């Protein structure tokens, strides 16, 4: 559940960095080279399903990248807004009243 | 025992009779929703 995942992850910067690191590691874990990994007399035809599923795992990684991109856009907008409010306060009515 | 209490009980009975159709509609909605949430795999929220 994407909403549950986002709610669990939250808006902590350490949480965002951890999500990025874990997603990158998982995406790297899907190096699809051998398709028909047939273990036994009956050839387990996991090839095309696994290739498309790896494409889907990378698609979920890109979706998580987009969701974290929106979350980091909100976080960077908030941080820049707070810093710019402080800078505007210093420029208009500085601390030396 | 009182006339006002008997009238209140009668009003409650009439409200229950009027809301019986609403309760049947809610029961049908609940059955359809249980079926849909099961079929689509729309897992219920943990606190839900």
């Amino acid at each position: 559940q994407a909403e549950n995942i986002y709610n669990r992850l939250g808006e902590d910067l350490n949480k965002w960095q951890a999500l990025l690191v874990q997603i990158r590691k998982a995406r790297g874990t899907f190096d699809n080279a051998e398709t028909k990994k047939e273990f036994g007399p009956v050839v387990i035809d996991y090839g095309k399903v696994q290739s498309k599923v790896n494409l889907k795992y990378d698609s979920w990684h890109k979706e998580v990248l987009s969701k974290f991109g929106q979350m980091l856009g909100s976080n960077m907008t908030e941080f820049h807004s707070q810093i710019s409010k402080s800078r505007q306060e210093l420029e208009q009515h500085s601390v030396d009243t | 025992a009182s006339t006002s209490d008997a009238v209140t009980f009668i009003t409650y009975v009439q409200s229950l009779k009027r809301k019986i159709k609403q309760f049947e509609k809610q029961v049908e909605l609940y059955r359809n929703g249980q079926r849909l949430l099961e079929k689509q795999r729309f897992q219920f929220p943990p606190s839900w």
Binding site: Q1, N4, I5, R8, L9, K15, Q17, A18, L19, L20, V21, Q22, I23, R24, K25, A26 | R41, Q43, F44, P46
Partner: peptide, 24 residues
């Protein structure tokens, strides 16, 4: 790493909740 640890923790929690929902 804590990154993949949290990712896999959310994955395992989702898996457990879904499997409970996936009695079928």
């Amino acid at each position: 790493s804590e990154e993949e640890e949290g990712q896999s923790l959310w994955s395992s929690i989702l898996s457990e909740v879904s499997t409970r929902a996936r009695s079928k």
